[PDB]
Amino acid sequence: PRLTVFDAMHQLLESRDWSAVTMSDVAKAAGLSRQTLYSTFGNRQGLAQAYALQLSEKFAGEIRDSIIRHPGQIELALSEGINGFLRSSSRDPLIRALVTGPDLLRLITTEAGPLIERATEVLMPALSESWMRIEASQARLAASIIARIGISFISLPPEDPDQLASGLTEVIAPYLQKVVQ
Amino acid sequence: GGRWSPRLTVFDAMHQLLESRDWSAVTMSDVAKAAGLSRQTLYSTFGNRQGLAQAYALQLSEKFAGEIRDSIIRHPGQIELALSEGINGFLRSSSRDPLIRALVPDLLRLITTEAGPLIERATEVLMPALSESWMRIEASQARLAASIIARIGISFISLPPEDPDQLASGLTEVIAPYLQKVVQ
């Protein structure tokens, strides 16, 4: 039901605007019935919200993977993770859409905490049950702050593409080094 | 220090107006009446309703960044107390503001998502608060931290915090470690 449809919306969105995408076309490209789509996602609003939750999840994972990949190297783990998110966030057609224009999309990027909540759910374990062994409260704290900053750079992208990455590493690493165990 | 300027009298007018009306039941006509300016001078300096709410937001941006800077200046040598007080004071203002209340509105999402003139102003107030205050942070790093503080702060207006204070003291604990590394 879910995981192949996001794939369909991406490839569809590379050639069309967000207005040249309707439930019909998405079901055809996904290989699903118009019945299964409307039944599980509802509207174009509920569709784009599932896409955002998937983006939320993927981006937080980019950071989590870099954390696992680099034990003992906090600044290098972050630097790699933050560059990966900024890279994916650029290549995404719905995120590339929003910053060209989509009122429904701004609704989810400002009045959706399910996005922050999912991203926090991926981040927290990468902080507390990873090698960092950070206490669960401080992992929550840092995870929410990392999530909100991440959204801030998809809403308004950074003019400096990566000198943002290299800067934001430098701000958050001193915290993590202090709370690491 | 005086609020006779074209812009400053409009913002006062708008604020007082917004206490009792929504941003949608308020038009240029009304703002020109309350400011004591002509409909001609309004469009002449501001453009339209967008230019009105956008300059109001620039004033909010500066006002919020001032809260943080004032707490920095007020507590020299206390990095954690300055941040703790600054953020708390900012959150209080952001609550009591009528246009921010109003935002919970397509044009408002435009300024709070596609306005870096907001981040830029907040950054112009915040940078010296870090770079030319007692913290003596280099302009390179101050600009950096100032932008992140601006962007986080904006974020807590778009999506408000579930925790009223456990957000503020939380964000302090995240940012104080960075400042402590750079305070010379």
Tab-separated table of N, CA and C in Angstrom, chain B residues 4-128:
chain	number	residue	atom	x	y	z
B	4	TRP	N	7.838	59.030	16.074
B	4	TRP	CA	7.149	59.876	15.074
B	4	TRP	C	7.410	59.441	13.627
B	5	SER	N	8.281	58.449	13.423
B	5	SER	CA	8.682	58.077	12.092
B	5	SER	C	7.469	57.543	11.376
B	6	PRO	N	7.485	57.596	10.044
B	6	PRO	CA	6.394	57.007	9.255
B	6	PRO	C	6.176	55.567	9.670
B	7	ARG	N	7.240	54.757	9.577
B	7	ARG	CA	7.057	53.338	9.828
B	7	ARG	C	6.600	53.098	11.245
B	8	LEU	N	7.293	53.688	12.237
B	8	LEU	CA	7.032	53.379	13.653
B	8	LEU	C	5.601	53.720	14.093
B	9	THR	N	5.004	54.807	13.552
B	9	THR	CA	3.626	55.156	13.929
B	9	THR	C	2.614	54.171	13.327
B	10	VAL	N	2.950	53.556	12.189
B	10	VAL	CA	2.056	52.592	11.566
B	10	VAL	C	2.034	51.307	12.379
B	11	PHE	N	3.194	50.902	12.878
B	11	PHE	CA	3.285	49.681	13.655
B	11	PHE	C	2.545	49.793	14.963
B	12	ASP	N	2.703	50.918	15.658
B	12	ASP	CA	1.907	51.166	16.853
B	12	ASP	C	0.423	51.096	16.517
B	13	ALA	N	0.029	51.741	15.411
B	13	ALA	CA	-1.373	51.734	15.018
B	13	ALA	C	-1.853	50.313	14.794
B	14	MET	N	-1.080	49.543	14.035
B	14	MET	CA	-1.390	48.164	13.734
B	14	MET	C	-1.479	47.276	14.928
B	15	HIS	N	-0.511	47.417	15.835
B	15	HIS	CA	-0.543	46.655	17.076
B	15	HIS	C	-1.862	46.904	17.823
B	16	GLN	N	-2.133	48.167	18.201
B	16	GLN	CA	-3.348	48.490	18.951
B	16	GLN	C	-4.598	48.017	18.217
B	17	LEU	N	-4.612	48.176	16.892
B	17	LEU	CA	-5.724	47.686	16.093
B	17	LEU	C	-5.875	46.182	16.269
B	18	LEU	N	-4.761	45.451	16.173
B	18	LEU	CA	-4.779	43.996	16.194
B	18	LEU	C	-5.208	43.415	17.543
B	19	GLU	N	-5.198	44.209	18.618
B	19	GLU	CA	-5.662	43.682	19.892
B	19	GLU	C	-7.118	43.273	19.816
B	20	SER	N	-7.917	44.005	19.029
B	20	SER	CA	-9.366	43.834	18.961
B	20	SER	C	-9.888	43.338	17.610
B	21	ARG	N	-9.042	43.148	16.594
B	21	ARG	CA	-9.507	42.653	15.299
B	21	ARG	C	-8.591	41.538	14.795
B	22	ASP	N	-9.086	40.759	13.837
B	22	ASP	CA	-8.183	39.824	13.184
B	22	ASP	C	-7.340	40.537	12.139
B	23	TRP	N	-6.318	39.846	11.652
B	23	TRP	CA	-5.565	40.436	10.567
B	23	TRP	C	-6.396	40.461	9.281
B	24	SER	N	-7.450	39.655	9.198
B	24	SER	CA	-8.275	39.689	8.002
B	24	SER	C	-9.400	40.718	8.048
B	25	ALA	N	-9.876	41.090	9.237
B	25	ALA	CA	-10.849	42.165	9.346
B	25	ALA	C	-10.189	43.535	9.443
B	26	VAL	N	-8.915	43.637	9.050
B	26	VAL	CA	-8.150	44.884	9.089
B	26	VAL	C	-7.652	45.166	7.686
B	27	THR	N	-8.011	46.334	7.155
B	27	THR	CA	-7.593	46.731	5.830
B	27	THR	C	-6.750	48.003	5.911
B	28	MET	N	-6.082	48.319	4.796
B	28	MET	CA	-5.248	49.516	4.638
B	28	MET	C	-5.897	50.833	5.082
B	29	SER	N	-7.172	50.968	4.690
B	29	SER	CA	-8.070	52.038	5.122
B	29	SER	C	-8.006	52.231	6.634
B	30	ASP	N	-8.331	51.154	7.371
B	30	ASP	CA	-8.295	51.160	8.831
B	30	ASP	C	-6.918	51.555	9.362
B	31	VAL	N	-5.844	50.993	8.784
B	31	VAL	CA	-4.502	51.288	9.287
B	31	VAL	C	-4.170	52.747	9.051
B	32	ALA	N	-4.507	53.271	7.871
B	32	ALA	CA	-4.298	54.692	7.601
B	32	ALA	C	-5.086	55.582	8.582
B	33	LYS	N	-6.317	55.196	8.950
B	33	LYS	CA	-7.074	55.983	9.928
B	33	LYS	C	-6.392	55.991	11.294
B	34	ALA	N	-5.994	54.811	11.784
B	34	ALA	CA	-5.414	54.726	13.120
B	34	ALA	C	-4.019	55.350	13.186
B	35	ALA	N	-3.266	55.318	12.101
B	35	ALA	CA	-1.957	55.942	12.143
B	35	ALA	C	-2.062	57.440	11.936
B	36	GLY	N	-3.175	57.915	11.382
B	36	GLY	CA	-3.269	59.328	11.096
B	36	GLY	C	-2.497	59.693	9.861
B	37	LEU	N	-2.334	58.730	8.956
B	37	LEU	CA	-1.637	58.902	7.697
B	37	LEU	C	-2.645	58.728	6.563
B	38	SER	N	-2.262	59.189	5.387
B	38	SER	CA	-3.137	59.035	4.244
B	38	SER	C	-3.001	57.646	3.638
B	39	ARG	N	-4.126	57.165	3.082
B	39	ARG	CA	-4.126	55.979	2.233
B	39	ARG	C	-3.031	56.115	1.183
B	40	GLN	N	-2.733	57.341	0.760
B	40	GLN	CA	-1.689	57.553	-0.235
B	40	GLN	C	-0.309	57.291	0.336
B	41	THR	N	-0.035	57.807	1.543
B	41	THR	CA	1.265	57.582	2.188
B	41	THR	C	1.474	56.123	2.576
B	42	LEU	N	0.399	55.414	2.934
B	42	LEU	CA	0.524	53.999	3.242
B	42	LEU	C	1.078	53.235	2.049
B	43	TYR	N	0.334	53.235	0.933
B	43	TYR	CA	0.780	52.519	-0.256
B	43	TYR	C	2.121	53.089	-0.734
B	44	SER	N	2.383	54.359	-0.433
B	44	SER	CA	3.610	55.015	-0.881
B	44	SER	C	4.857	54.438	-0.210
B	45	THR	N	4.788	54.141	1.095
B	45	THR	CA	5.918	53.531	1.791
B	45	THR	C	5.860	51.996	1.813
B	46	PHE	N	4.657	51.380	1.828
B	46	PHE	CA	4.500	49.951	2.110
B	46	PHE	C	4.059	49.049	0.957
B	47	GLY	N	3.582	49.569	-0.157
B	47	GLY	CA	3.039	48.663	-1.162
B	47	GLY	C	1.603	48.228	-0.889
B	48	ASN	N	1.351	47.089	-0.257
B	48	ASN	CA	-0.034	46.661	-0.014
B	48	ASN	C	-0.086	46.000	1.359
B	49	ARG	N	-1.141	45.215	1.604
B	49	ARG	CA	-1.240	44.445	2.843
B	49	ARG	C	-0.037	43.557	3.103
B	50	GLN	N	0.583	43.037	2.051
B	50	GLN	CA	1.777	42.230	2.239
B	50	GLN	C	2.897	43.095	2.809
B	51	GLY	N	3.158	44.248	2.182
B	51	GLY	CA	4.175	45.163	2.695
B	51	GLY	C	3.887	45.674	4.095
B	52	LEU	N	2.609	45.700	4.483
B	52	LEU	CA	2.213	46.059	5.847
B	52	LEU	C	2.605	44.975	6.851
B	53	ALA	N	2.108	43.748	6.647
B	53	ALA	CA	2.458	42.630	7.520
B	53	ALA	C	3.939	42.285	7.411
B	54	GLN	N	4.573	42.550	6.265
B	54	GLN	CA	5.998	42.273	6.194
B	54	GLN	C	6.828	43.258	7.022
B	55	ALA	N	6.543	44.562	6.948
B	55	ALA	CA	7.276	45.485	7.813
B	55	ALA	C	6.929	45.262	9.292
B	56	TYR	N	5.662	44.949	9.616
B	56	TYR	CA	5.327	44.597	10.995
B	56	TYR	C	6.193	43.457	11.481
B	57	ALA	N	6.374	42.431	10.630
B	57	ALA	CA	7.210	41.278	10.959
B	57	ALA	C	8.664	41.686	11.130
B	58	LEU	N	9.166	42.589	10.277
B	58	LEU	CA	10.503	43.140	10.507
B	58	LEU	C	10.612	43.810	11.870
B	59	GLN	N	9.557	44.496	12.315
B	59	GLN	CA	9.601	45.094	13.644
B	59	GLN	C	9.582	44.035	14.721
B	60	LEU	N	8.766	42.997	14.551
B	60	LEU	CA	8.745	41.907	15.523
B	60	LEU	C	10.102	41.223	15.589
B	61	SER	N	10.679	40.948	14.424
B	61	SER	CA	11.997	40.351	14.336
B	61	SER	C	13.018	41.115	15.175
B	62	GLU	N	13.104	42.426	14.963
B	62	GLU	CA	14.037	43.269	15.703
B	62	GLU	C	13.722	43.278	17.185
B	63	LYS	N	12.439	43.356	17.512
B	63	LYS	CA	12.007	43.406	18.898
B	63	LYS	C	12.373	42.124	19.634
B	64	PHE	N	12.148	40.961	18.998
B	64	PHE	CA	12.467	39.674	19.617
B	64	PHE	C	13.969	39.513	19.792
B	65	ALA	N	14.740	39.783	18.735
B	65	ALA	CA	16.194	39.753	18.840
B	65	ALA	C	16.715	40.725	19.898
B	66	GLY	N	16.046	41.858	20.108
B	66	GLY	CA	16.466	42.756	21.170
B	66	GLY	C	16.335	42.145	22.554
B	67	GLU	N	15.273	41.366	22.783
B	67	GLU	CA	15.073	40.696	24.067
B	67	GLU	C	16.288	39.880	24.444
B	68	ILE	N	16.771	39.090	23.483
B	68	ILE	CA	17.932	38.246	23.699
B	68	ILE	C	19.183	39.094	23.927
B	69	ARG	N	19.409	40.086	23.068
B	69	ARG	CA	20.557	40.961	23.243
B	69	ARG	C	20.530	41.675	24.586
B	70	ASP	N	19.362	42.197	25.004
B	70	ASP	CA	19.279	42.891	26.294
B	70	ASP	C	19.649	41.967	27.445
B	71	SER	N	19.187	40.722	27.410
B	71	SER	CA	19.585	39.770	28.435
B	71	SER	C	21.074	39.474	28.365
B	72	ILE	N	21.650	39.412	27.166
B	72	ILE	CA	23.098	39.229	27.077
B	72	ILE	C	23.824	40.385	27.750
B	73	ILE	N	23.428	41.616	27.426
B	73	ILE	CA	24.079	42.790	28.006
B	73	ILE	C	23.851	42.843	29.516
B	74	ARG	N	22.636	42.508	29.955
B	74	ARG	CA	22.280	42.622	31.363
B	74	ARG	C	23.100	41.675	32.239
B	75	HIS	N	23.494	40.492	31.752
B	75	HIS	CA	24.221	39.511	32.575
B	75	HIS	C	25.606	39.194	32.018
B	76	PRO	N	26.617	40.056	32.249
B	76	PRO	CA	27.971	39.767	31.742
B	76	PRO	C	28.652	38.655	32.535
B	77	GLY	N	29.375	37.791	31.830
B	77	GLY	CA	29.962	36.661	32.496
B	77	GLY	C	29.026	35.490	32.779
B	78	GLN	N	27.700	35.653	32.676
B	78	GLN	CA	26.753	34.544	32.886
B	78	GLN	C	26.113	34.150	31.535
B	79	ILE	N	26.773	33.226	30.817
B	79	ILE	CA	26.288	32.802	29.503
B	79	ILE	C	24.943	32.103	29.620
B	80	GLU	N	24.822	31.166	30.566
B	80	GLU	CA	23.577	30.411	30.709
B	80	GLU	C	22.443	31.259	31.244
B	81	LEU	N	22.730	32.205	32.121
B	81	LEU	CA	21.649	33.025	32.640
B	81	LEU	C	21.166	34.001	31.584
B	82	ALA	N	22.092	34.558	30.792
B	82	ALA	CA	21.700	35.446	29.701
B	82	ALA	C	20.822	34.732	28.673
B	83	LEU	N	21.234	33.551	28.207
B	83	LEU	CA	20.400	32.808	27.252
B	83	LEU	C	19.039	32.445	27.859
B	84	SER	N	19.057	31.876	29.066
B	84	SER	CA	17.846	31.465	29.755
B	84	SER	C	16.852	32.607	29.871
B	85	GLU	N	17.330	33.774	30.287
B	85	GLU	CA	16.465	34.936	30.402
B	85	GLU	C	16.068	35.484	29.043
B	86	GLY	N	17.005	35.546	28.097
B	86	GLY	CA	16.674	36.093	26.794
B	86	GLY	C	15.593	35.292	26.093
B	87	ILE	N	15.778	33.974	26.026
B	87	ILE	CA	14.813	33.129	25.342
B	87	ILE	C	13.463	33.208	26.023
B	88	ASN	N	13.447	33.168	27.357
B	88	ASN	CA	12.189	33.241	28.091
B	88	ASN	C	11.473	34.531	27.774
B	89	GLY	N	12.205	35.650	27.821
B	89	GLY	CA	11.627	36.941	27.462
B	89	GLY	C	11.115	36.980	26.036
B	90	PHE	N	11.875	36.400	25.098
B	90	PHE	CA	11.403	36.294	23.719
B	90	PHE	C	10.099	35.494	23.639
B	91	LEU	N	10.051	34.334	24.287
B	91	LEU	CA	8.846	33.517	24.221
B	91	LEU	C	7.643	34.269	24.778
B	92	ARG	N	7.850	35.046	25.837
B	92	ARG	CA	6.746	35.798	26.411
B	92	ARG	C	6.193	36.801	25.410
B	93	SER	N	7.085	37.601	24.790
B	93	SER	CA	6.701	38.568	23.757
B	93	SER	C	5.975	37.895	22.601
B	94	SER	N	6.560	36.818	22.084
B	94	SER	CA	5.969	36.090	20.979
B	94	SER	C	4.568	35.586	21.308
B	95	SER	N	4.286	35.354	22.582
B	95	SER	CA	2.929	34.978	22.945
B	95	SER	C	1.997	36.187	22.914
B	96	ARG	N	2.387	37.268	23.591
B	96	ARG	CA	1.545	38.447	23.747
B	96	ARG	C	1.348	39.219	22.448
B	97	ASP	N	2.014	38.824	21.349
B	97	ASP	CA	1.877	39.615	20.131
B	97	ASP	C	0.581	39.291	19.412
B	98	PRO	N	-0.193	40.318	19.022
B	98	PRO	CA	-1.499	40.072	18.383
B	98	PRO	C	-1.407	39.466	16.984
B	99	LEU	N	-0.421	39.843	16.164
B	99	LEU	CA	-0.270	39.235	14.841
B	99	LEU	C	0.233	37.794	14.907
B	100	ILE	N	0.901	37.416	16.005
B	100	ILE	CA	1.405	36.048	16.171
B	100	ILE	C	0.298	35.136	16.681
B	101	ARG	N	-0.424	35.590	17.713
B	101	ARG	CA	-1.754	35.067	17.999
B	101	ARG	C	-2.580	34.869	16.719
B	102	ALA	N	-2.641	35.908	15.867
B	102	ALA	CA	-3.431	35.852	14.628
B	102	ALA	C	-3.063	34.658	13.749
B	103	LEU	N	-1.770	34.348	13.644
B	103	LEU	CA	-1.216	33.308	12.773
B	103	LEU	C	-1.653	31.902	13.194
B	104	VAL	N	-2.378	31.784	14.314
B	104	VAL	CA	-3.055	30.537	14.678
B	104	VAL	C	-4.425	30.775	15.357
B	105	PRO	N	-4.422	31.787	6.329
B	105	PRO	CA	-3.448	32.873	6.531
B	105	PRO	C	-2.191	32.691	5.635
B	106	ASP	N	-2.399	32.687	4.320
B	106	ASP	CA	-1.338	32.320	3.383
B	106	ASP	C	-0.169	33.290	3.416
B	107	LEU	N	-0.470	34.590	3.432
B	107	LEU	CA	0.559	35.621	3.407
B	107	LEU	C	1.454	35.508	4.641
B	108	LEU	N	0.866	35.189	5.806
B	108	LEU	CA	1.653	35.017	7.030
B	108	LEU	C	2.619	33.835	6.935
B	109	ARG	N	2.199	32.730	6.312
B	109	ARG	CA	3.112	31.612	6.096
B	109	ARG	C	4.253	32.019	5.155
B	110	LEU	N	3.940	32.838	4.131
B	110	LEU	CA	4.954	33.438	3.245
B	110	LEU	C	6.075	34.143	4.016
B	111	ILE	N	5.732	34.943	5.042
B	111	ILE	CA	6.806	35.709	5.688
B	111	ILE	C	7.569	34.849	6.690
B	112	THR	N	6.914	33.874	7.299
B	112	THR	CA	7.520	33.064	8.342
B	112	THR	C	8.221	31.817	7.789
B	113	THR	N	8.178	31.605	6.478
B	113	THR	CA	8.845	30.516	5.781
B	113	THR	C	9.730	30.999	4.628
B	114	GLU	N	9.198	31.901	3.799
B	114	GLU	CA	9.943	32.533	2.712
B	114	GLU	C	10.309	33.990	3.006
B	115	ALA	N	10.645	34.290	4.255
B	115	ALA	CA	11.306	35.547	4.559
B	115	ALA	C	12.531	35.265	5.417
B	116	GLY	N	13.667	35.457	4.753
B	116	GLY	CA	14.959	35.667	5.324
B	116	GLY	C	15.262	37.122	5.598
B	117	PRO	N	14.486	38.082	5.068
B	117	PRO	CA	14.623	39.444	5.607
B	117	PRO	C	14.348	39.473	7.087
B	118	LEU	N	13.541	38.521	7.571
B	118	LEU	CA	13.306	38.379	8.998
B	118	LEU	C	14.542	37.855	9.707
B	119	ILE	N	15.097	36.752	9.206
B	119	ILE	CA	16.321	36.178	9.753
B	119	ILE	C	17.449	37.179	9.677
B	120	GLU	N	17.507	37.916	8.582
B	120	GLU	CA	18.585	38.859	8.384
B	120	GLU	C	18.525	39.988	9.411
B	121	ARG	N	17.336	40.533	9.677
B	121	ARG	CA	17.224	41.595	10.682
B	121	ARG	C	17.590	41.072	12.060
B	122	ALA	N	16.957	39.962	12.465
B	122	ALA	CA	17.277	39.337	13.735
B	122	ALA	C	18.781	39.117	13.832
B	123	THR	N	19.406	38.689	12.722
B	123	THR	CA	20.851	38.495	12.713
B	123	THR	C	21.607	39.798	12.877
B	124	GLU	N	21.115	40.889	12.287
B	124	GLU	CA	21.785	42.168	12.483
B	124	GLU	C	21.707	42.644	13.926
B	125	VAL	N	20.620	42.352	14.646
B	125	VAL	CA	20.567	42.694	16.068
B	125	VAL	C	21.411	41.723	16.892
B	126	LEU	N	21.348	40.426	16.564
B	126	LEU	CA	21.996	39.409	17.383
B	126	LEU	C	23.500	39.427	17.237
B	127	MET	N	24.002	39.751	16.060
B	127	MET	CA	25.440	39.621	15.883
B	127	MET	C	26.243	40.456	16.844
B	128	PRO	N	26.000	41.772	16.894
B	128	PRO	CA	26.697	42.598	17.893
B	128	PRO	C	26.439	42.160	19.330
